[PDB]
Amino acid sequence: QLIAVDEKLDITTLTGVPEEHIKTRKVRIFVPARNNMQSGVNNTKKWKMEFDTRERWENPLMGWSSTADPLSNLVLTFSTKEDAVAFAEKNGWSFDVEERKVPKPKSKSYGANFSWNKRTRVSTK
Amino acid sequence: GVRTSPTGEKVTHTGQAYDDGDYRRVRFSDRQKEVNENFAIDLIAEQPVSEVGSRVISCDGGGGALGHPRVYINLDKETKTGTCGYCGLQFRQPHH
């Protein structure tokens, strides 16, 4: 009832993607960096897969922004790095993986503001 | 406050005009170029500055709920006048 065939998964021939949008693309798998304008960290929880930026030009009428690559807006979400890597490999996309950046824990001390001899003593508050 | 480009086209309030070598001007031949003749910057520059004997004044653009969100403007700086960020009206304290 089981084949037990040994080969890496490959579904490129079944997805209908054109040839030049498989081998020429370079996906990036990363945890998005926090927007520095805000302190909330809820946007840095999941992994993202996104494609490489292609040409954008000006529409001769209306001066709008025109594109020719169909994957310009494609972003996928993943729970772990391994899941995204597996998806990319089974879809035949060359990928670059960036390790997650976590802000290291810090030593905070309110009393250090009023130091007797150290430089941590603040001049205003 | 519509001006005229050296080529002959009317310069819009955003300041746009095709340069002399621009082929896109061909779109206006046998037709016209849509330009609004009422320039908002000139029109708001014509409003007189209101004289108020208060340190802080509120502006909603007029008309009550038909205006813009009500904002409060400080008039401590005597060198300039307070300007509404929505409407462009100017307010000033009675110096001297």
């Binding site: 084949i3 037990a4 040409e55 | -």
Partner: protein
């Protein structure tokens, strides 16, 4: 391990048998399709197109992928024989309105930034 449920074929041999059956069906159908749709292509180049479409997937070594491709090709043949397709659908395999894309490095460098 790596045990998976089959679709139609247990090993590659049954998959190739199904592929050959589908290829025979397409080869038989090509002349009738050429005549029925009043195509300006020849039977020879239609069969060349069938051969090229089959050869596009020649690198598959997974029987499940193979018989899924066979299922899709059989669906395509069903659409062609029953005249559910129009002339435009059949002629889409040939890309007659697309200007050719050069492959060499210099031409791609000249036309733009796209590799």
């Amino acid at each position: 391990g790596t045990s998976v449920k089959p679709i139609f074929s247990r090993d590659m041999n049954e998959a190739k048998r199904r592929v050959r059956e589908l290829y025979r069906a397409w080869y038989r159908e090509v002349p009738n399709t050429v005549h029925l749709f009043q195509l300006d292509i020849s039977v020879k180049q239609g069969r060349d197109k069938v051969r090229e479409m089959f050869m596009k997937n020649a690198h598959v070594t997974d029987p499940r992928v193979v018989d899924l491709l066979v299922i899709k090709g059989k669906m395509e043949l069903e659409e062609t024989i029953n005249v559910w397709k129009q002339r435009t659908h059949i002629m889409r395999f040939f890309h007659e309105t697309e200007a050719p894309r050069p492959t060499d490095f210099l031409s791609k460098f000249y036309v733009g930034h796209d590799p």
